[PDB]
Symmetry: D2
Subunit: 506 residues, 4 copies
Amino acid sequence: TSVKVVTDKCTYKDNELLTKYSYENAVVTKTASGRFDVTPTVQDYVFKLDLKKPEKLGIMLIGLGGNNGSTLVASVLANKHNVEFQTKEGVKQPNYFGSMTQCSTLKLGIDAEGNDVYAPFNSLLPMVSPNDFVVSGWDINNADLYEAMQRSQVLEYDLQQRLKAKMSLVKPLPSIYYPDFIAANQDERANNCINLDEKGNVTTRGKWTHLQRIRRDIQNFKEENALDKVIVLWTANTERYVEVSPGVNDTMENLLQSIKNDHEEIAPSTIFAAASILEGVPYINGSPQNTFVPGLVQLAEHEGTFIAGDDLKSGQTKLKSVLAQFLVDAGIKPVSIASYNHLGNNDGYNLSIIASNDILYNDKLGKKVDHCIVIKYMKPVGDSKVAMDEYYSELMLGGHNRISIHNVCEDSLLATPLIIDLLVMTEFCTRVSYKKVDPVKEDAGKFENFYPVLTFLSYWLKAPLTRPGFHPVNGLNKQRTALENFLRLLIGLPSQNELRFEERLL
Amino acid sequence: TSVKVVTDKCTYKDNELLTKYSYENAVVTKTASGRFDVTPTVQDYVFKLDLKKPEKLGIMLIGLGGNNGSTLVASVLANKHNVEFQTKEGVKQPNYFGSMTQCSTLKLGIDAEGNDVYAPFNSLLPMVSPNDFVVSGWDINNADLYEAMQRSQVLEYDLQQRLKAKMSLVKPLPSIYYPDFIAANQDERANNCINLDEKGNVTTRGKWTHLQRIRRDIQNFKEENALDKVIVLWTANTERYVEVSPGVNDTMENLLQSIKNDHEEIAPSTIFAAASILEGVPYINGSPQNTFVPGLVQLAEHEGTFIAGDDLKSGQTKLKSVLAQFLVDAGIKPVSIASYNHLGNNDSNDILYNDKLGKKVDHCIVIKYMKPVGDSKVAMDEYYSELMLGGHNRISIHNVCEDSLLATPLIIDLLVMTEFCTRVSYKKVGKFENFYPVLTFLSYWLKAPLTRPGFHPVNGLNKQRTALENFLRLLIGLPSQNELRFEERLL
Amino acid sequence: TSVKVVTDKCTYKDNELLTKYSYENAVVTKTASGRFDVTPTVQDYVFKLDLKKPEKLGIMLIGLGGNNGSTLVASVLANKHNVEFQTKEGVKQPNYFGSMTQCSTLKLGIDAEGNDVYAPFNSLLPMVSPNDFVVSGWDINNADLYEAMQRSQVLEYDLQQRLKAKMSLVKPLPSIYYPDFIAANQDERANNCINLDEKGNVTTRGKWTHLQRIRRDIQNFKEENALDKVIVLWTANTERYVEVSPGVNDTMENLLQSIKNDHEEIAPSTIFAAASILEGVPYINGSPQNTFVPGLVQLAEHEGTFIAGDDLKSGQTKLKSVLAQFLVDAGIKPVSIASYNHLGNNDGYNLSIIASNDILYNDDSKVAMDEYYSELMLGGHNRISIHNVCEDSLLATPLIIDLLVMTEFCTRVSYKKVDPVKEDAGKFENFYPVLTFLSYWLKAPLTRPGFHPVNGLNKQRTALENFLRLLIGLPSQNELRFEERLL
Amino acid sequence: TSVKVVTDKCTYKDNELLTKYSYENAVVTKTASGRFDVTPTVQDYVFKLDLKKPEKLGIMLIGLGGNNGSTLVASVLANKHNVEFQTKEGVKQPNYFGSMTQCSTLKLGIDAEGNDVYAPFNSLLPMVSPNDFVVSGWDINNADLYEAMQRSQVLEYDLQQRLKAKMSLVKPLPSIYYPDFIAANQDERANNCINLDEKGNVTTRGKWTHLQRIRRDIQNFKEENALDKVIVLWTANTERYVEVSPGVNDTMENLLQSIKNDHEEIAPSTIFAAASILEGVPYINGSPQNTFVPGLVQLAEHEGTFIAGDDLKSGQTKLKSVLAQFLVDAGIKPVSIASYNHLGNNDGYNLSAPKQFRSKEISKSSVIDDIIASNDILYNDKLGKKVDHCIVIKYMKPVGDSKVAMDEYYSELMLGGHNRISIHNVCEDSLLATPLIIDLLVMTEFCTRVSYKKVDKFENFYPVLTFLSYWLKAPLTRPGFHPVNGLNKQRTALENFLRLLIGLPSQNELRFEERLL
Ligand SMILES: NC(=O)c1ccc[n+]([C@@H]2O[C@H](COP(=O)([O-])OP(=O)(O)OC[C@H]3O[C@@H](n4cnc5c(N)ncnc54)[C@H](O)[C@@H]3O)[C@@H](O)[C@H]2O)c1
């Protein structure tokens, strides 16, 4: 499918789309007798979109041999090659269910009877297909992707067998292993490392050489596959937070020298992110550690390359967000949120809204929500994960409400389509540039790319890497709306209002 | 708290607010190929909002002596008189928790730092407070509201006692009882009926006479309380649906005639609705039965009076909505929805669903009666969806709570919004007009939203709230929410 | 694997075992003044057990092509030939998990240090192994068992494939199809029926010829397999209950006559039951219908054959029973019990303790959920919810195996009720045709005219355990452990 | 109601029931060939029961001002004085629901129809009623019991108001406070202590005088209420396990000496235990801590005084055990059990500290091992003797005494199938523990009036009344004996004890009058 809007806001020229958009917002000021003084603001923009998308997109994953990496490669091959497979429920055709860019829809408007008309999320503007991903990456373990699948226990046995021949040919590149950064148990899995000494052992020495090695890898992968575009994504084991100290990783220059100095606060991801930036390739952090120290963020700004992330947002987390928001929107006051969960995969083994509502949360009836988060490792559960979150909330006149959400599913089958989403949306953003219109000075403007931090990806990240003078904004619903309204405006359509006046009125 | 927006779209002349609004949408078409041709549309309006709100809002509940009815009255009194009460957790202050109009907020914009600023949902435009509701109504049982509270077993004992003296003085008016629409359990309890014979017995004969008595009741309630603004809401036992047959209830003329004929397709609710429409007061159906037959809806357009309803949307039905919506918007394909919910009281994506992959979704709906639990009912909903490459996802939603403690603030929300909507009229760009008789704006609070023919009902809980949010916003010269945050995303 | 008890209560003949047992119980009589008068009682018995079990045991399932039937044959074959299979979790070995007789243990006593010593349930006495089951049966649909496995969607794909060659060889015999007894949504699949009229169409007439055909089927099955013993179990779609009518199915002669006269109330299962009894073959009803009408019960008593049943007991039913029991034993008063269910097998498609406690009570992947609301002291409350997810065929199959193993065992046991004042004499008698020892696995136990069908799961396993114990000279379990407490 | 059993086994003298009983069992040995050699064993006994129980039983609770303590007192008063109270569900009558001794029944036999006949658990032999309980006790906090109720938020507001007058007069005695033994966040509460120095500040010096004070406390409570029988029960904050060392607490000699030396391995519970033993009064340990150190156990033996305890088995745990039993007896192999739960009382707030949590963590995994142990068919080196288990107990103040417990089992079925069972449990935890406390006291009293003698001079049960393991999560046993956690087997041992004493044999369930005949 394809979409064509009749608008005077858009002009297509030589695989290039120019769109006018007037951004409206409002600045508020509450004071005195509690009066909210709101002053609307307007800012006109011109968006430019390279309509020409990569025929093939290179993807390089750190942790390629794990559950997510294994599964991501399997899904691209299975789908690209229409690899149907046998299950106890019969033959099945591959798909990308769980992917918003591949399997969700957006409301374009209404037809003749006044009913909504939805179109595929990726049918509005040109987006790259996961079927066109050319995937590679690094892993401290040398097992090929077929062996990786076997070890992960995520995919149907018969699907692994039909993909055996191809997955066996995929081997992860050696990686950077600095033992002290991951969960104890690891020196055994690590058997494919570049950072070796004269005798071929450990070594956290030569971090800048490691950095160079990684940059060569990116250059090699790019040329050997005749790839113009490449994106890097960390989906490896969570590392132990790095301390942010002045003079070391506080600035571009400082960080860069610290790496050269083989400093203790220079983790493997730090080098991967730095190497990607230096190569000009977008870098996404799918783990919770804080690799985006202030010195790295400056580097990206300096280089003018995109970065994003900090922990892939799990399904349970999303649901929690949606659920908590719903209660509050309805004026329900949650007092506690007991969250629990346990899995038996390597991820867990390694791991082995009050502000918006002062009516409910204030200094008279309570401003806090007692909530605990427990994550246990239960090996016999496998990739399958069991999450349970309970909400005990206050209702009117001394009443209470207890809601329990139980969730069971193979974690990696949820994570892989989200990785696909992060990759497709990241590529899409790279082809987007803009320029703010100066009311007074007609021209002179020059297009620019988004701020080096792609917050448009917050939908898929648990802890959004916040830009300096602003606070992170989660709220899953608010996050999809933004993405939806962005595609909309690029094609000359206004944000969704839900007013349906062609029904409520006259 | 108040909100003052600096805009040139908002006018003011004699306690009136005039706001200009350009409504944008887009008509879509599809072709041989999946080619979607979108043609944006526009229509400018001028909305007029009467800022003079009633000092007192009359509320008339059919089923005033039930769980929702008695609880509604107790919440108005407790809050209005700040009746704090004792609980084994300590003395508690009354509130309207569970009420969107009373306890939720709206984002007005950002502050100097770039942070979102939230204001009370009811602080944007003048809205009536439930503390100013004057409540009465009808019930087939003569028990006063103190006796009703005891029967309902909804509220804290101590609160019931501190409210005893006031609730004991509230007696529901006699109502219309047509046994063949509920009966049995609510059969015996019927000792407050107007439809009696000369021998003093319940009769379904003299219906039009029943209509006249209800219109009168409405009139007397206004007079005795010095109110001119009244809203009627159905929160009584569910009735057996009726048949919409031609010549009977297909037109207002036929409808009115059928009532005179003592027709059997004329339920008590048909009579309460009709009498309210005739009295020109808004009527809301908090039950699932098909009250608004075409004849009634016709009569309401003609009289130009608000009608809205069809079942108070319960909490679990709201969770389910938000839940399913979440999944589909994530590219996840729900398959099963084995839903269940027993109580012990008296009461869009063809990518996943298409021909090839299948557009079928088996939905299970169970409701059992088990009195032991009392008002505190328990709901359980289970979803089984398909993930990529043969995997599945199983989500269970368990909910426990006193049903009426969630229904009451929802009734409050409906009444508060219905009143707000009566002070609103618009004009396209002629004289002004009022919303179409069927207030679909209140869909957020009703399971089976009554809609205009040709239109499909949209039940997405979040979209319904968005509509309301955007309505209040536009009335004060604010654009819908874009969530683009370009001051944060763009250099 | 074996157990030897040093005791003078047991004598071993050729292939016989004779065990003396003194049975104690008590009769109680509560006087109006509320007093309980308890008169202890004792009744001595002599049990005889034929130790020579069948080398091969014939099994004939009605509904052989269903989820339970196809899964049963698959389990026997996989375990018998040690067919390991592939899964996401790696290579798995076949087993009989979920089977009490095959995978549970019993406490024999204590060791030197006073510690409990457990032995396999099936090691106390000789019991037939499900690996020695020779299976056949009937089904109104003729798909071979490989196709049945595909249709059921119960087993691991790789296992189905490894079992393909062998399961393909098993085809269910034609069955008796009286459409007026099922849920209708089983009419399209019926293409394997013996009850066909002149024009070859499905008829409800000639029921006596149908019954003789089933007897032919049983005799043939034995003969062709050189089988000595066979058991018949009904694990087919649930039938519509039949109303017991005087002069119709109230007695043996009546029943038999109503069959010859193609009467309305003779269900296909009635004929299967009757044919089995007439062939001296035990018969087990795994469905809820009241197949065992008075007439059938009498025909069985006269024939000296076994009958048992009324609905294979589900895992959630077993669970509820233990839970409710637990609460009542703790003095808690359950006032609410909301049970729920929804499976993924053709079982559902066709689907479309208060007397003990006078103190508190006075004047294929199925998903089950049960919630209990009980009142605690001083007005408090307790809310317990049991959520259960599993492929019920994987639970039913081992339950069917236990039923067949226990039924076979009981057929090798006979007794003599000893008379004190009448030494010697009294030829050994077989259990009462109705086997209440199998109550453990059946949701609605079949019982005698004046007795109440016990459902306490815990008690049902205790009865079975103590039975095996007494047959080898061991007393019942007291749990007194005076080895400690007293000293 | 009462039971009368016609049997030449019972000699009902002048308030002295004498009963003959032959206890059968068997000793097993397993040959390398795989054969079990079982040899039956019998032992005749004579049981003597003092039919004359006390008209009033003295109950002294350590932790009297807590959730359980105040709730127990409230239940006794409400029931004894038939104090009905109001609730949103109407006026209710007080009762002892949740109490096995007051609300469960036992099968006596059958009627003339072959049907089961049940009678009240307490109708067989005389037992003391909780209405005759005379309660007092200690607490490091001086709040009277009405304030203790308000603070616990366990009972109906109206019920508390009705009991306000009488409970305001109940004040706990000063107790012994050794700070380095409790959670931590409790020292602000410690305002009722006996162990105070010259300035009047806590101190761990003089543990023997402390010992002497508790003994006298017992003696005073007894005479002030004209009581003859008293039972002490620990229902206070869980203490940290104590370190049992040689020459300090390995022998009663050492233990008493260590106390006189204010030794640091001598906890407050250790002292209440010793004091109770020296006064000849039964001592029940309701917490998980290892109070009953070997030397203390020795003392109980030498003095001939009953002791019993270690964890007040939450109903949730009892339930988990039953289910795991049902599964293994069904041939189903659990390969994982995830326990979880959060509560907002002082119990949970205390268990926060990992040193106290450890005590509770133990006596949770114990069961799983016995179950794995009983079935070598499912659990062995070949298939795996593995069964994953985790116990998570979070403190969530917003829920109060209402504890929410969730337990999930993942078992393997045949041919690679699996089964997932979830148990969700919610209730006022103290409303389950209180009636449980009542059972332990009634059954302890009952056991004190029971003596025996092996025949072919009477004695008393071994100090450790393992007979009470049904209500104890951490069964306390002997040297060479493993604990029996099978909840079902624990009640049957009780049913069979009572039956036996009245001439009835153990239940067999054979029902030969229905199966045979
Ligand atoms: N799996 C899920 O369901 C899930 C859900 C939400 C978030 N996450 C996130 O994604 C991450 C990966 O999850 P997973 O299931 O794929 O993990 P996994 O343990 O199966 O795989 C991680 C892989 O990282 C490799 N690795 C570790 N350190 C490395 C290094 N320095 N260089 C290269 N390779 C290295 C390991 O060898 C392993 O193959 C987690 O750490 C977490 O941040 C995972």
